[PDB]
Amino acid sequence: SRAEDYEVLYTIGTGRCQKIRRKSDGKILVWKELDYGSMTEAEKQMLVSEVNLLRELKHPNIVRYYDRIIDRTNTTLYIVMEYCEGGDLASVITKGTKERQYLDEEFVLRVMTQLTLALKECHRRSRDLKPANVFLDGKQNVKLGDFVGTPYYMSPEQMNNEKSDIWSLGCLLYELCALMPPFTAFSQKELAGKIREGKFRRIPYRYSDELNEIITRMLNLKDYHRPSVEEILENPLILEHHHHHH
Ligand SMILES: CC[C@H]1CN(c2nc(-c3cc(OC)c(OC)c(OC)c3)cnc2N)CC[C@H]1C(=O)O
Ligand SMILES: [Cl-]
Ligand SMILES: [Cl-]
Ligand SMILES: [Cl-]
Ligand SMILES: [Cl-]
Ligand SMILES: [Cl-]
Ligand SMILES: [Cl-]
C-alpha cells in the first residue's frame, strides 16, 4: 500500500481529510492525513497502537478502516477508510436549525437503532457520542467514527460505566429532535447545575410519546434507571428497516 495507489480528488476538511480514489478499481474512499514529524518515539508508538485498534473494528455501524500508508519523506501517515457521502450529524442538525425544519421521526429512529448497535459493539470489545463523530453513508446507514467547548453531554456520574454512554446517546438523540441539547448554559458551572436538576423540555410534539419516553428514560439522573442497549432495542418503535442495509 503506497500513496501512489490512490489519487486525491479534493479536501473535505482540515491534519487533512481527503476524498480519494483507488486507482485499481476506482473505489471512492477517504484518508486522514497525519504529520508525525514533530512526534516523539513514545507518541509514535502510541500512534501505532491506536491504528492497530482501528484495524480490528469491523461492524456495519462503525466507520470502516481500510489501510494505513506511511510517507517517510513528508513524515506523513495516511489512514484510509470508507467514504460517508452524507457527512456528519452535526451538519445535519445545524442545517435543520437554520432552515427551521425538524428531522423526520423515521430518521431519528434509524440513528437510535444503529448507534445503539455501534455502542453495543464497543462495549463488547473493551469513542465519544457527539454529532460531529456520527456519519451517514449513501444508503441511510449511520456510522460511529472516532477545553474551550462546553461539555453538553457529560453525564451526572462523570461530573463527579456503560450507562454513562446511554446518557450521552440520549443527549444526542434529544438534540437531533429539538435541534438543541437538553441542557444549555453559558458556563460549565451553570451547565452542571442544570444537569443535576435533570429537567428539560419535552422534545417537539411532532415526535411520538413513545420516542419522547425512551429518550427521557436515557436522560434519567440515576444510571440504573436508564435502559440498557438490550432494553433500547426491545422497544416497539425499533423495526428491521431502521437497521443497516448494504
Ligand atoms: C477522516 C476523519 C473523520 C471524518 N471521516 C469521514 N468524513 C466524511 C465527511 C463528508 C462530508 O461531506 C461529503 C462532510 O461535510 C459535512 C464531512 O464533515 C466533517 C465529513 C466522509 N467520510 C468519512 N470517512 C471519517 C471518520 C473520522 C475519523 O476521525 O475516524
Ligand atoms: Cl451497512
Ligand atoms: Cl424549528
Ligand atoms: Cl416526523
Ligand atoms: Cl425531574
Ligand atoms: Cl417543545
Ligand atoms: Cl447497555
CSV table of C-alpha atoms and ligand atoms in Angstrom, one decimal:
chain,number,residue,atom,x,y,z
A,1,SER,CA,0.0,0.0,0.0
A,2,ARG,CA,1.6,3.2,-1.3
A,3,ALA,CA,0.1,6.7,-1.7
A,4,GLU,CA,0.6,6.4,-5.5
A,5,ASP,CA,-2.0,3.7,-5.4
A,6,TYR,CA,-4.6,6.4,-4.8
A,7,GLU,CA,-5.4,9.8,-6.2
A,8,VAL,CA,-6.7,12.7,-4.2
A,9,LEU,CA,-9.9,14.2,-5.6
A,10,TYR,CA,-10.2,17.1,-3.1
A,11,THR,CA,-10.1,18.1,0.5
A,12,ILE,CA,-13.2,17.6,2.6
A,13,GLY,CA,-11.8,19.2,5.8
A,14,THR,CA,-8.7,20.2,7.7
A,15,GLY,CA,-4.5,17.3,9.7
A,16,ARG,CA,-6.4,16.9,6.4
A,17,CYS,CA,-9.3,14.7,5.5
A,18,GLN,CA,-9.4,14.0,1.7
A,19,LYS,CA,-11.7,12.2,-0.7
A,20,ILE,CA,-9.6,9.8,-2.7
A,21,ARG,CA,-9.9,7.3,-5.5
A,22,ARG,CA,-8.2,3.9,-5.5
A,23,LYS,CA,-6.7,3.5,-9.0
A,24,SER,CA,-7.0,-0.2,-9.3
A,25,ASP,CA,-10.8,-0.4,-9.2
A,26,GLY,CA,-11.8,3.3,-8.9
A,27,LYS,CA,-13.3,2.8,-5.5
A,28,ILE,CA,-14.1,6.1,-3.7
A,29,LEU,CA,-12.6,6.3,-0.2
A,30,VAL,CA,-11.2,8.9,2.2
A,31,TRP,CA,-7.9,9.3,4.0
A,32,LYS,CA,-6.9,11.2,7.1
A,33,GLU,CA,-3.5,12.9,6.7
A,34,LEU,CA,-1.3,12.9,9.9
A,35,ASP,CA,2.0,14.7,10.0
A,36,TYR,CA,4.0,12.8,12.7
A,37,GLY,CA,7.3,14.7,12.0
A,38,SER,CA,7.1,16.5,15.4
A,39,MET,CA,6.2,13.4,17.4
A,40,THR,CA,8.5,11.6,19.9
A,41,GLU,CA,9.2,7.9,19.6
A,42,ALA,CA,6.8,7.5,22.5
A,43,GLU,CA,3.9,9.2,20.8
A,44,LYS,CA,4.6,7.4,17.5
A,45,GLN,CA,4.4,4.1,19.4
A,46,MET,CA,1.2,5.3,20.9
A,47,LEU,CA,0.0,6.1,17.4
A,48,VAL,CA,0.9,2.6,16.2
A,49,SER,CA,-1.2,1.1,19.0
A,50,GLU,CA,-4.2,3.3,18.1
A,51,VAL,CA,-4.1,2.4,14.4
A,52,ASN,CA,-3.9,-1.3,15.1
A,53,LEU,CA,-7.0,-1.0,17.3
A,54,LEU,CA,-8.9,0.7,14.4
A,55,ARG,CA,-8.0,-2.2,12.1
A,56,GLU,CA,-9.7,-4.7,14.4
A,57,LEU,CA,-13.1,-2.8,14.4
A,58,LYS,CA,-15.4,-4.5,11.8
A,59,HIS,CA,-19.0,-3.5,12.2
A,60,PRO,CA,-21.6,-2.1,9.8
A,61,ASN,CA,-22.3,0.8,12.2
A,62,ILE,CA,-18.6,1.8,12.8
A,63,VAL,CA,-16.7,3.7,10.1
A,64,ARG,CA,-14.6,1.1,8.3
A,65,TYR,CA,-10.8,1.3,8.3
A,66,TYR,CA,-9.1,0.0,5.2
A,67,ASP,CA,-5.4,0.8,5.2
A,68,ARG,CA,-2.5,2.8,6.6
A,69,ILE,CA,0.1,4.4,4.4
A,70,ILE,CA,3.4,5.7,5.5
A,71,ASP,CA,5.2,8.5,3.6
A,72,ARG,CA,8.5,8.7,5.4
A,73,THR,CA,9.7,11.5,3.2
A,74,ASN,CA,7.0,14.0,4.2
A,75,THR,CA,6.7,12.3,7.6
A,76,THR,CA,3.0,11.7,6.8
A,77,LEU,CA,0.8,8.8,7.9
A,78,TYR,CA,-2.5,8.2,5.9
A,79,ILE,CA,-5.4,6.3,7.4
A,80,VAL,CA,-7.6,5.0,4.6
A,81,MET,CA,-11.3,4.4,5.3
A,82,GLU,CA,-14.8,4.3,3.8
A,83,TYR,CA,-16.4,7.4,2.5
A,84,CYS,CA,-19.6,8.6,4.1
A,85,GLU,CA,-21.3,10.7,1.5
A,86,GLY,CA,-23.9,12.1,3.9
A,87,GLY,CA,-21.3,13.8,6.1
A,88,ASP,CA,-21.7,14.2,9.9
A,89,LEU,CA,-24.7,14.6,12.2
A,90,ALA,CA,-23.5,18.0,13.4
A,91,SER,CA,-24.1,19.4,9.9
A,92,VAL,CA,-27.5,17.8,9.6
A,93,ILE,CA,-28.6,19.5,12.9
A,94,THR,CA,-27.2,22.9,12.1
A,95,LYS,CA,-29.0,22.5,8.7
A,96,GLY,CA,-32.3,21.8,10.4
A,97,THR,CA,-31.7,24.7,12.8
A,98,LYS,CA,-31.0,27.3,10.1
A,99,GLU,CA,-33.8,26.1,7.8
A,100,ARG,CA,-36.2,25.9,10.7
A,101,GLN,CA,-37.1,22.3,9.8
A,102,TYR,CA,-37.3,19.4,12.2
A,103,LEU,CA,-35.9,15.9,11.2
A,104,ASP,CA,-38.3,13.0,10.5
A,105,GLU,CA,-39.1,10.6,13.4
A,106,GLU,CA,-38.0,7.8,11.0
A,107,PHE,CA,-34.5,9.3,10.7
A,108,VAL,CA,-34.2,9.7,14.5
A,109,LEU,CA,-35.2,6.0,14.9
A,110,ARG,CA,-32.5,5.0,12.4
A,111,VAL,CA,-29.9,6.9,14.4
A,112,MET,CA,-31.1,5.5,17.7
A,113,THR,CA,-31.1,1.9,16.4
A,114,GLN,CA,-27.8,2.0,14.6
A,115,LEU,CA,-25.8,4.0,17.2
A,116,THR,CA,-27.2,1.7,19.9
A,117,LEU,CA,-25.8,-1.3,18.0
A,118,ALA,CA,-22.4,0.5,17.5
A,119,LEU,CA,-22.4,1.2,21.2
A,120,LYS,CA,-23.2,-2.5,22.0
A,121,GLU,CA,-20.2,-3.5,19.9
A,122,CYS,CA,-17.9,-1.0,21.6
A,123,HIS,CA,-18.9,-2.5,25.0
A,124,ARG,CA,-18.2,-6.0,23.7
A,125,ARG,CA,-14.6,-5.3,22.7
A,126,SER,CA,-13.2,-3.3,25.6
A,127,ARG,CA,-15.2,7.0,21.1
A,128,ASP,CA,-17.4,9.9,22.2
A,129,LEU,CA,-21.1,10.1,21.1
A,130,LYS,CA,-21.5,13.6,19.7
A,131,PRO,CA,-23.0,14.7,16.4
A,132,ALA,CA,-19.6,15.5,14.9
A,133,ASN,CA,-18.5,11.9,15.4
A,134,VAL,CA,-21.5,10.3,13.7
A,135,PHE,CA,-21.5,9.9,9.9
A,136,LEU,CA,-24.1,9.0,7.2
A,137,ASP,CA,-23.4,6.9,4.1
A,138,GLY,CA,-25.4,7.0,0.9
A,139,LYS,CA,-27.8,4.2,1.9
A,140,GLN,CA,-29.4,5.5,5.1
A,141,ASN,CA,-26.8,3.9,7.3
A,142,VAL,CA,-25.4,5.5,10.4
A,143,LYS,CA,-21.7,5.1,11.5
A,144,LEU,CA,-19.8,5.9,14.6
A,145,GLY,CA,-16.3,7.4,13.9
A,146,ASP,CA,-13.6,8.5,16.4
A,147,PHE,CA,-11.3,22.5,26.8
A,148,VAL,CA,-12.9,25.5,25.1
A,149,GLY,CA,-16.1,23.7,24.5
A,150,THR,CA,-19.0,23.2,26.9
A,151,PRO,CA,-19.4,19.5,27.7
A,152,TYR,CA,-23.1,19.4,26.8
A,153,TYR,CA,-23.3,15.6,27.0
A,154,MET,CA,-21.5,14.9,30.3
A,155,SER,CA,-23.5,12.5,32.5
A,156,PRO,CA,-24.2,13.2,36.2
A,157,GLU,CA,-21.8,10.3,37.1
A,158,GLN,CA,-18.9,11.7,35.0
A,159,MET,CA,-19.1,15.2,36.5
A,160,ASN,CA,-18.4,13.6,39.9
A,161,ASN,CA,-19.9,2.9,33.2
A,162,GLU,CA,-21.8,1.8,30.2
A,163,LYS,CA,-25.0,3.5,31.4
A,164,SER,CA,-23.0,6.8,31.1
A,165,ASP,CA,-22.9,6.1,27.3
A,166,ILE,CA,-26.7,5.7,27.4
A,167,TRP,CA,-27.0,9.2,28.8
A,168,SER,CA,-24.8,10.6,26.0
A,169,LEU,CA,-26.9,8.8,23.4
A,170,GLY,CA,-30.0,10.3,25.0
A,171,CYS,CA,-28.4,13.8,24.7
A,172,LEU,CA,-27.5,13.2,21.0
A,173,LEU,CA,-31.0,11.9,20.1
A,174,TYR,CA,-32.6,14.7,22.1
A,175,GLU,CA,-30.5,17.3,20.1
A,176,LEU,CA,-31.5,15.6,16.8
A,177,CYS,CA,-35.2,16.1,17.7
A,178,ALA,CA,-35.1,19.5,19.3
A,179,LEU,CA,-32.2,21.0,17.4
A,180,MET,CA,-30.7,22.0,20.7
A,181,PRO,CA,-29.2,19.9,23.5
A,182,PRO,CA,-31.3,19.1,26.6
A,183,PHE,CA,-29.2,21.2,28.9
A,184,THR,CA,-27.8,24.6,27.8
A,185,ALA,CA,-25.7,27.1,29.7
A,186,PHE,CA,-23.1,29.8,29.2
A,187,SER,CA,-20.5,28.3,31.6
A,188,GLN,CA,-19.7,24.7,32.7
A,189,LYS,CA,-20.8,25.5,36.3
A,190,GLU,CA,-24.2,26.7,35.2
A,191,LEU,CA,-24.4,23.6,32.9
A,192,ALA,CA,-23.5,21.3,35.8
A,193,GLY,CA,-26.3,23.0,37.9
A,194,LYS,CA,-28.9,22.2,35.2
A,195,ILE,CA,-27.7,18.6,34.7
A,196,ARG,CA,-28.1,17.9,38.5
A,197,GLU,CA,-31.8,19.1,38.4
A,198,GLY,CA,-32.3,16.7,35.4
A,199,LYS,CA,-35.1,18.8,33.9
A,200,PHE,CA,-35.6,19.6,30.2
A,201,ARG,CA,-38.2,20.5,27.7
A,202,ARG,CA,-40.2,17.7,26.0
A,203,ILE,CA,-39.0,17.1,22.5
A,204,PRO,CA,-41.2,18.7,19.9
A,205,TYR,CA,-44.8,17.5,19.6
A,206,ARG,CA,-44.3,16.2,16.1
A,207,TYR,CA,-42.5,13.3,17.8
A,208,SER,CA,-44.4,10.4,19.3
A,209,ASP,CA,-45.0,9.9,23.0
A,210,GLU,CA,-43.1,6.6,22.6
A,211,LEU,CA,-40.0,8.3,21.2
A,212,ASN,CA,-40.2,11.1,23.9
A,213,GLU,CA,-40.5,8.4,26.5
A,214,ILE,CA,-37.3,6.4,25.6
A,215,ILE,CA,-35.2,9.5,25.1
A,216,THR,CA,-36.4,10.7,28.5
A,217,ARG,CA,-35.5,7.4,30.1
A,218,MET,CA,-32.0,7.6,28.7
A,219,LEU,CA,-31.7,11.0,30.4
A,220,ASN,CA,-32.6,9.7,33.9
A,221,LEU,CA,-30.5,11.0,36.7
A,222,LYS,CA,-29.9,7.5,38.0
A,223,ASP,CA,-27.7,5.4,35.8
A,224,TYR,CA,-29.6,2.3,36.9
A,225,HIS,CA,-32.9,3.7,35.6
A,226,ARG,CA,-31.5,4.2,32.1
A,227,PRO,CA,-32.3,1.4,29.7
A,228,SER,CA,-29.5,-0.9,28.6
A,229,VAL,CA,-28.7,-1.3,24.9
A,230,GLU,CA,-30.8,-4.5,25.1
A,231,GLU,CA,-33.8,-2.7,26.6
A,232,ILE,CA,-33.4,0.0,24.0
A,233,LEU,CA,-33.5,-2.4,21.1
A,234,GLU,CA,-36.5,-4.3,22.5
A,235,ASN,CA,-38.6,-1.1,22.1
A,236,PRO,CA,-41.7,-1.5,19.8
A,237,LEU,CA,-40.5,1.6,18.0
A,238,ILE,CA,-37.5,-0.2,16.6
A,239,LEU,CA,-38.0,-2.2,13.4
A,240,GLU,CA,-36.0,-4.0,10.8
A,241,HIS,CA,-35.9,-1.1,8.3
A,242,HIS,CA,-34.3,1.1,11.0
A,243,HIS,CA,-31.2,-1.2,10.9
A,244,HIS,CA,-28.3,-1.0,8.5
A,245,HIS,CA,-28.7,-2.3,4.9
A,246,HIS,CA,-25.9,-2.8,2.3
B,1,LIG,C1,-11.3,11.2,8.2
B,1,LIG,C2,-11.5,11.5,9.6
B,1,LIG,C3,-13.0,11.5,10.1
B,1,LIG,C4,-14.1,12.0,9.1
B,1,LIG,N1,-14.4,10.9,8.3
B,1,LIG,C5,-15.3,11.0,7.1
B,1,LIG,N2,-15.9,12.2,6.8
B,1,LIG,C6,-16.7,12.4,5.7
B,1,LIG,C7,-17.3,13.7,5.5
B,1,LIG,C8,-18.1,14.0,4.3
B,1,LIG,C9,-18.7,15.4,4.2
B,1,LIG,O1,-19.5,15.7,3.1
B,1,LIG,C10,-19.4,14.9,2.0
B,1,LIG,C11,-18.6,16.3,5.3
B,1,LIG,O2,-19.2,17.6,5.2
B,1,LIG,C12,-20.3,17.8,6.1
B,1,LIG,C13,-17.8,16.0,6.5
B,1,LIG,O3,-17.7,16.9,7.5
B,1,LIG,C14,-17.0,16.7,8.7
B,1,LIG,C15,-17.2,14.6,6.6
B,1,LIG,C16,-17.0,11.3,4.8
B,1,LIG,N3,-16.4,10.1,5.1
B,1,LIG,C17,-15.6,9.9,6.2
B,1,LIG,N4,-15.0,8.6,6.4
B,1,LIG,C18,-14.3,9.5,8.8
B,1,LIG,C19,-14.4,9.4,10.3
B,1,LIG,C20,-13.5,10.4,11.0
B,1,LIG,C21,-12.5,9.9,12.0
B,1,LIG,O4,-11.7,10.6,12.6
B,1,LIG,O5,-12.3,8.5,12.2
B,2,CL,CL,-24.0,-1.3,6.2
B,3,CL,CL,-37.6,25.0,14.1
B,4,CL,CL,-42.0,13.0,11.8
B,5,CL,CL,-37.0,15.6,37.4
B,6,CL,CL,-41.4,21.8,22.9
B,7,CL,CL,-26.1,-1.3,27.8
